[PDB]
Design an enzyme around this catalytic site. Structure first.
Site, PDB file in Angstrom:
ATOM      1  N   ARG B  55      -7.079  13.125  -4.683  1.00 45.21           N
ATOM      2  CA  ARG B  55      -7.684  11.833  -4.384  1.00 45.21           C
ATOM      3  C   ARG B  55      -7.783  11.663  -2.878  1.00 45.21           C
ATOM      4  NH1 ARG B  55      -5.654   6.044  -6.934  1.00 45.21           N
ATOM      5  NH2 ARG B  55      -7.180   4.673  -5.908  1.00 45.21           N
ATOM      6  N   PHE B  60      -8.520   5.923   4.355  1.00 43.57           N
ATOM      7  CA  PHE B  60      -7.457   5.157   3.716  1.00 43.57           C
ATOM      8  C   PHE B  60      -6.244   6.034   3.420  1.00 43.57           C
ATOM      9  CE2 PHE B  60      -5.462   3.467  -0.177  1.00 43.57           C
ATOM     10  CZ  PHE B  60      -5.099   2.212   0.261  1.00 43.57           C
ATOM     11  N   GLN B  63      -4.298  11.881  -1.353  1.00 44.31           N
ATOM     12  CA  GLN B  63      -3.238  11.847  -2.351  1.00 44.31           C
ATOM     13  C   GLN B  63      -3.060  13.206  -3.014  1.00 44.31           C
ATOM     14  OE1 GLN B  63      -3.615   8.614  -5.099  1.00 44.31           O
ATOM     15  NE2 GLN B  63      -1.772   9.139  -6.262  1.00 44.31           N
ATOM     16  N   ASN B 102       2.422   5.084  -6.677  1.00 49.94           N
ATOM     17  CA  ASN B 102       2.933   4.528  -7.923  1.00 49.94           C
ATOM     18  C   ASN B 102       1.833   3.710  -8.587  1.00 49.94           C
ATOM     19  OD1 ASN B 102       2.906   1.851  -6.808  1.00 49.94           O
ATOM     20  ND2 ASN B 102       4.969   2.149  -5.983  1.00 49.94           N
ATOM     21  N   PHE B 113       1.250  10.457  -0.885  1.00 51.54           N
ATOM     22  CA  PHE B 113      -0.018  10.361  -0.184  1.00 51.54           C
ATOM     23  C   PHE B 113       0.218  10.215   1.311  1.00 51.54           C
ATOM     24  CE2 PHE B 113       1.151   6.098  -1.515  1.00 51.54           C
ATOM     25  CZ  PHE B 113       0.978   5.343  -0.376  1.00 51.54           C
ATOM     26  N   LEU B 122      -0.667  -2.286   1.286  1.00 55.08           N
ATOM     27  CA  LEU B 122       0.328  -1.500   0.572  1.00 55.08           C
ATOM     28  C   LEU B 122       1.748  -1.824   1.009  1.00 55.08           C
ATOM     29  CD1 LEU B 122      -1.449   1.966   0.461  1.00 55.08           C
ATOM     30  CD2 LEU B 122      -1.410   0.153  -1.284  1.00 55.08           C
ATOM     31  N   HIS B 126       4.368   0.549  -1.812  1.00 54.51           N
ATOM     32  CA  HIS B 126       4.715   1.962  -1.827  1.00 54.51           C
ATOM     33  C   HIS B 126       5.809   2.222  -0.803  1.00 54.51           C
ATOM     34  CE1 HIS B 126       1.300   2.663  -4.413  1.00 54.51           C
ATOM     35  NE2 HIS B 126       0.494   2.115  -3.521  1.00 54.51           N
TER      36      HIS B 126
END
Ligand SMILES: O=P(O)(O)O[C@H]1[C@H](OP(=O)(O)O)[C@@H](OP(=O)(O)O)[C@H](OP(=O)(O)O)[C@@H](OP(=O)(O)O)[C@H]1OP(=O)(O)O
Lengths: 38, 177, 56, 56, 56, 56
Positions: B55, B60, B63, B102, B113, B122, B126
């Site tokens: 990902r 941003f 992942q 998560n 990530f 976030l 996270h």
């Protein structure tokens, strides 16, 4: 049984007093002219 | 003659050898002992070997950490998703942060990530267990350079070829067989 | 600083020996405390009770 | 600077009225006897941090 | 006597209220503000108990 | 020592856990300085001794 409530010592003055309302109102009896003078 | 940058000192170091080059990760094992223990052991277990980065969201995050490569997989060393760990001294103000993905609270898997930039949404979500060292930073960013196909998946996803733990803060970690 | 940097020791930065300076601010604070209590008291009181209307 | 420190010394000595009137009022004892305060023991450092947060 | 309490109690209270910006807290906002009046007092007692350079 | 935008530290989160790192101290001679030497650098030296001080 009446108990006085404990006040928090770091509490600020709660409410605002500044507001202003006109003075309130029997008279005792008094018991106390010539044209030229006029 | 003072320009201040505040952050707690790290502990532990781990090398990730990827198709995008080397990446040095300095870990905080004082703040995040659970996720750094998980990460160190999973690296010592060869669990991250030949695992892609599935990902990539431009500017941003990027992942990875799924052995299945689908993105919904991966598991921790604890036999269950472990707890989240947060600190006011660990924030996302920048790219170069290595954090745990998560689907919710206490959901922490083996997936992690890299931050491609600032994410302020976030925060308190996270856990941040590490950061990438400046010298190796560009290589992390090359993980994020791909032609991205449907559902944020690169057409030729970069992979983690091997793992080296350069400094292990934990005494007791025993890799599983 | 004069006495401390007497011999081999130079003009360099490192002299610790605060006790004196520390005293001085404490004396200051001893006195200023009641002032700030009275002034901050009034500040709070104006904030909550209101600036007095009369200017009597 | 030596001359100025003597000036402070002497002035203090000249100025030294006895208290001249005395009250034994206590603050922390009043605060502590009231349920809104509790007492404990902490690391100085920890208290310091707490005070700075409170002031902010 | 006002027996002293576990230190974690105060630790957690402040940590809960760390910014009294929480919707839940409300009434502390007035109470906290009121204290400001005794904050300088608190400071003076803090500072006068600094640890000295031979104490860890 | 910290940025404005850096919030104050939870004592418990960082400080509490960590070691204290050595203080200044001094190397008193075991022989000559023995009387003083056992309690010289404690906080309130002889607080628990009914021989040397009044008491608590
Ligand atoms: O020698 P240093 O450790 O660096 O001390 C200097 C210096 O002291 P000396 O020049 O006497 O050695 C300055 O003296 P001047 O340059 O002004 O002659 C003094 O200045 P003051 O006379 O105002 O004390 C200055 O302080 P500052 O830089 O604020 O002027 C102070 O160093 P600190 O700044 O470290 O006090």
């Amino acid at each position: 049984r009446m108990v006085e409530m404990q006040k928090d010592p770091m509490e600020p003055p709660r409410f605002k007093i500044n507001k202003k309302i006109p003075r309130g109102p029997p008279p005792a009896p008094v018991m106390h002219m010539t044209v030229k003078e006029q | 003659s003072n320009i201040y940058i505040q952050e707690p000192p790290t502990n532990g170091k781990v090398l990730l050898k990827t198709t995008a080059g080397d990446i040095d990760i300095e870990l905080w094992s004082k703040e995040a002992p659970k996720a750094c223990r998980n990460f160190i052991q999973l690296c010592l277990e060869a669990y991250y070997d030949n695992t892609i980065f599935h990902r990539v969201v431009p500017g941003f995050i990027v992942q990875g950490g799924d052995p299945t490569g689908t993105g919904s997989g991966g598991e921790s060393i604890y036999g269950a998703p472990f707890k989240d760990e947060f600190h006011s001294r660990l924030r996302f103000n920048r790219r170069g942060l290595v954090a745990m993905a998560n689907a919710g609270s206490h959901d922490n898997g083996s997936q992690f990530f890299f931050t491609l930039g600032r994410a302020d949404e976030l925060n308190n979500k996270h856990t941040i267990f590490g950061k990438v060292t400046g010298d190796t930073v560009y290589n992390m960013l090359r993980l994020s350079e791909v032609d991205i196909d449907d559902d944020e998946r690169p057409h030729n996803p970069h992979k983690i070829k091997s793992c080296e733990v350069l400094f292990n803060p934990f005494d007791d970690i025993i890799p599983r067989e | 600083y004069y006495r401390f940097n007497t011999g081999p020791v130079g003009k360099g930065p490192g002299c610790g020996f605060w006790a004196a300076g520390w005293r001085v601010w404490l004396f200051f604070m001893r006195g200023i405390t009641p002032l700030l209590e009275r002034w901050l008291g009034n500040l709070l009181a104006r904030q909550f009770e209101g600036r007095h209307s009369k200017g009597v | 600077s030596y001359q100025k420190l003597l000036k402070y010394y002497v002035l203090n000595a000249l100025k030294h009225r006895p208290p001249k009137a005395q009250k034994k009022r206590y603050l922390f004892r009043s605060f502590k006897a009231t349920k809104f305060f509790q007492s404990t023991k902490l690391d100085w450092v920890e208290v310091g941090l707490q005070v700075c947060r409170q002031g902010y | 006597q006002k027996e002293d309490m576990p230190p974690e109690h105060v630790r957690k209270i402040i940590r809960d209220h760390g910014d009294m910006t929480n919707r839940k807290f409300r009434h502390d906002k007035r109470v906290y503000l009121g204290a400001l009046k005794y904050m300088p007092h608190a400071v003076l007692k803090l500072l006068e108990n600094m640890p000295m350079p031979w104490e860890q | 020592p910290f940025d404005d935008e850096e919030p104050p530290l939870d004592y418990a989160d960082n400080i509490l856990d960590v070691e204290p790192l050595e203080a200044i101290q001094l190397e008193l001679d075991p022989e000559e300085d023995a009387p003083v030497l056992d309690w010289f650098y404690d906080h309130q030296p002889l607080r628990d001794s009914r021989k040397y001080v009044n008491g608590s």
